[PDB]
Amino acid sequence: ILSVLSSLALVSGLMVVRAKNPVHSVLFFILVFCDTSGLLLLLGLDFFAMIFLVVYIGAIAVLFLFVVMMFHIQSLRYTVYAGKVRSWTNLETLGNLLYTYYFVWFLVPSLILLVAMIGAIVLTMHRTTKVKRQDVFRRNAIDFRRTIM
C-alpha cells in the first residue's frame, strides 16, 4: 500500500505553501523530502534516496530550520538472465559515467560548489574577519587633533 502513500508528500507540499507558522512549513518540508526519498527507494534508486536524506534533510532543511529558529518570520515478464550475472550497484553505474565520460558536467558542479563557498564567505562573513577586522584605520598627519572639531 506504500506505493500510493506519495499522497503524504503531496499534502505536505501543499502545507508548505499554505502555512503561516514557519515551524510547520519547515516540518512539512522535511516531510516532503522524507516521502520523496521513500519514493526514490520504491524505484530502487537507493543512492539517490540516501543523497536526498543527507544533502536535503541533514543540510538544506537544517539551514531552513536555522532560518526559522533564529530570524523568526512572525506472470508475463521474461527476465533476461543476462546482465544480471554482474549486478551494478547504483553508485558503481553512476561512477562509471560521471567521472570519466561526462566528467565536465562534474567539474562544472565543482565550480558551482566553489562559487557557493566563495558566496557564503563574501556574503555571510558579516564583517567578522579581515573583511572589516583589519582595523578601524587612522592617519595622524591629516588628523586635526583639536585644530578642527
Binding site: 543512492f47 544533502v55 539551514l63 562509471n96 567521472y99 570519466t100 565543482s110 563557498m117 574577519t129 573583511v131
Partner: protein
C-alpha cells in the same frame, strides 16, 4: 532494495520500543513518593558544501577500477577545486 524492508519495519519497532521507554517512567511514581552567531551559518553552509563533495566522492570511491587513471585525475581536478575553495575559506578565516 529488497533488503530495505527490515529497516523499514525497524523504524516502527524502534518507535514502539522508545514509546515503551517513554511510558515506563510515566506510569510508576504515583501520589506518594546573542543576537546571531553567523558562524553557525558559515559552519552550516560549509558542511553542506563538503557533504556535497563527499556525495561526489562516493561513486568515484566505489568505481575506481573502472575509471582507470582518468576518472582518478578528473576527481583530483574536482578535488583541487575543492582545495582551492577550502584554502580560500581557511585564509579568509571561516574555520574558527
Amino acid at each position: 532494495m529488497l533488503e530495505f524492508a527490515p529497516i523499514f519495519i525497524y523504524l516502527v519497532i524502534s518507535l514502539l520500543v522508545s514509546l515503551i521507554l517513554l511510558g515506563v517512567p510515566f506510569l510508576f511514581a504515583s501520589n506518594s513518593s546573542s543576537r546571531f552567531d553567523i558562524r553557525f551559518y558559515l559552519v552550516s553552509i560549509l558542511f553542506l558544501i563538503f557533504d556535497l563533495e563527499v556525495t561526489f566522492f562516493f561513486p568515484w570511491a566505489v568505481s575506481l577500477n573502472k575509471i582507470d587513471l582518468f576518472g582518478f585525475w578528473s576527481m583530483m581536478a574536482f578535488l583541487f577545486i575543492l582545495t582551492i575553495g577550502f584554502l580560500y575559506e581557511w585564509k579568509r578565516g571561516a574555520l574558527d
